[PDB]
Amino acid sequence: TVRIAFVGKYLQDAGDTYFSVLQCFEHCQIALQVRLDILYVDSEELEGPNADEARKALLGCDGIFVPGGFGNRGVDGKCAAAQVARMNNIPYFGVCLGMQVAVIELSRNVVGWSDANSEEFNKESTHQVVRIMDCDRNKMGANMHLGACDVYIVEKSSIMAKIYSKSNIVVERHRHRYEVNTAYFEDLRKAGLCISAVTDPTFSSRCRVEAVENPSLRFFLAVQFHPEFISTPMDPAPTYLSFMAAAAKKDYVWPQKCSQRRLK
Ligand SMILES: [Cl-]
Ligand SMILES: [Cl-]
Incomplete structure (x- = not known):
């Protein structure tokens, strides 16, 4: 059995929020032939004076997963999940908010920006490592990115390149508003993060980060898109x-060509 820490809410209070996420986990469980055992962890238990108690639970897992979520509930705990993963070489997978917390985590604990946050959770931060792009923004509000988008895999040695069968462009679907702040790409890279996929291969101020990895580790990957779509x-x-696969400590044979479901 493969123990995965699912960092968000208890089953009781999740509703149908993780319906498609859990469907995807089930597709994978079947493709790999592994007994999945998900630990549903309340992210708020990973914050505060007692958090070492919750961190211990994560250390006994084979993988640590942070899905998309809503509001600012448990952001610090989700960052703390990413920290445990990074510091202990436990496979990590983040989706949407899961990628954002990997960035925030790394900014606080390695880059040394104690106040690093998304603009969403702390408008006063002097290090808004995630923020709304200027081109998406109004005085009244901002774009809600939905639908399909070209994703450029820009690191040939990455997890992304490998799992998408060396395709240079893939197509995934979105539901987000905030992007990684392009002004901090150097600092993130210096701190061990690889930007492995982007919307714009020239890395301008309009370059939207679609995937980050930490190649010092066995498996640390977080994406902006929602792969479960x-x-x-x-x-x-x-x-x-x-x-x-990484959590189960198993190999997998990737196809010679990326499925047409994720190609243009
Ligand atoms: Cl949550
Ligand atoms: Cl891998």
Whole structure:
């Protein structure tokens, strides 16, 4: 059995929020032939004076997963999940908010910006490592990115390159508003983060980060897109599949060519 820490809420109070996420995990479970055992962890237990108690629970897991979530509930705990993963070489997979907390985590604990945050959770931060792009913004509000988008895999040695069968461009679907702040790419890179996929291969101020990795570690990957929006039992999301593979301590044969479901 493969123990995965699922960092968000208890089953009781999740509703149907993780319906598609759990479907994807199930596609993967079948493709890999592994007994998945998800630990549903309340992210708020990973913050405060007692958090070492919750951290211990994560250390006994084979993988640590942070899904998309809503509001600012448990952001510091989700960052703390990413920290445990990074410091202990426990496979990590983050989706949307899961990628944002990997960035915030790294900014606080390695870059040394104690006040690093997303603009979403702390408008007063002097290190808004995640923020709304200027081109998306109004005086009244900002774009809600939904739908399909070209994703450029820009690091040939990355997890992304591998799991998408060396395709240079793939197509994934979105639901987000805030992007990684392009002004801090150097600092993130210096701190060990690889920007492995982007919307714009020239890395301008309009370059939207689609995937980050930490190649010092066995498996540390976080994506902006929601991979669970494209997954079937026969064609599971490669991102989720590779995470579960790493957690199970198993290999997997990637196809010679990326499935057409994720190509233009
Ligand atoms: Cl949560
Ligand atoms: Cl891998």
